[PDB]
From Swiss-Prot:
Part of a complex comprised of PTPRA, BCAR1, BCAR3 (via SH2 domain) and SRC; the formation of the complex is dependent on integrin mediated-tyrosine phosphorylation of PTPRA. Interacts with DDEF1/ASAP1; via the SH3 domain. Interacts with CCPG1. Identified in a complex containing FGFR4, NCAM1, CDH2, PLCG1, FRS2, SRC, SHC1, GAP43 and CTTN. Interacts with ERBB2, STAT1 and PNN. Interacts with DDR1, DDR2 and DAB2. Interacts with CDCP1, TGFB1I1 and TOM1L2. Interacts with the cytoplasmic domain of MUC1, phosphorylates it and increases binding of MUC1 with beta-catenin. Expressed ubiquitously. Expressed in the skin (at protein level). Platelets, neurons and osteoclasts express 5-fold to 200-fold higher levels than most other tissues. The modification Phosphotyrosine is found at residue 43. It is linked to SRC kinase activity has been shown to be increased in several tumor tissues and tumor cell lines such as colon carcinoma cells. Residues 7-104 form the SH2 domain. The phosphorylated form is termed pp60c-src. S-nitrosylation is important for activation of its kinase activity. It is found in: Cell membrane; Mitochondrion inner membrane; Nucleus; Cytoplasm, Cytoskeleton. It comes from Homo sapiens. The SH2 and SH3 domains are important for the intramolecular and intermolecular interactions that regulate catalytic activity, localization, and substrate recruitment. Belongs to the protein kinase superfamily. Tyr protein kinase family. SRC subfamily. This is Proto-oncogene tyrosine-protein kinase Src. Non-receptor protein tyrosine kinase which is activated following engagement of many different classes of cellular receptors including immune response receptors, integrins and other adhesion receptors, receptor protein tyrosine kinases, G protein-coupled receptors as well as cytokine receptors. Participates in signaling pathways that control a diverse spectrum of biological activities including gene transcription, immune response, cell adhesion, cell cycle progression, apoptosis, migration, and transformation. May be involved in blister formation in Pemphigus vulgaris, phosphorylated-SRC is abundant at blister sites but not in normally adherent tissue, which corresponds with loss and disruption of CDH1 in cells adjacent to blisters. Phosphorylated SRC is increasingly abundant at pre-lesional sites of blister formation and occurs prior to changes in abundance of CDH1 and DSG3.
């Protein structure tokens, strides 16, 4: 089901996620989910941001998945699915650079 998600890019590198997100047309919150390069079993949420100090830039957030079933960036805020995690962060910025807006174009 995760592999079926249009925002799930699978096995792409961190640099590739940055190449895709650093497009001048991408508004704040453009995002994608990929596998972590070095953490087995973990995903990575790559998100674009923009401000006058840094200009267009990218942030990465590790998503952990417990055998017990929960998905989360912070253990205080867990979800029953990756889909629910993405939906929540599309409404709440919380500690992220921006709420998730649009799926990163390829
Ligand atoms: C996403 O998993 C993530 C989160 C924060 C920094 C980088 C990052 O991408 P990774 O593909 O996991 O690889 C780089 C990394 C650097 C430092 C610690 C963990 C991952």
């Amino acid at each position: 089901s995760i592999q079926a998600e249009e925002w799930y890019f699978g096995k792409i590198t961190r640099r590739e996620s940055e190449r895709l997100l650093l497009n001048a047309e991408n508004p704040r919150g453009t995002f994608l989910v990929r596998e972590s390069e070095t953490t087995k079993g973990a995903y990575c949420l790559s998100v674009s941001d923009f401000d006058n100090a840094k200009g267009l830039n990218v942030k990465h957030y590790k998503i952990r998945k417990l055998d017990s079933g929960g998905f989360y960036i912070t253990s205080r805020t867990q979800f029953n699915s990756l889909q629910q995690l993405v939906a929540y962060y599309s409404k709440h910025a919380d500690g992220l650079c921006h709420r998730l807006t649009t799926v990163c174009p390829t």
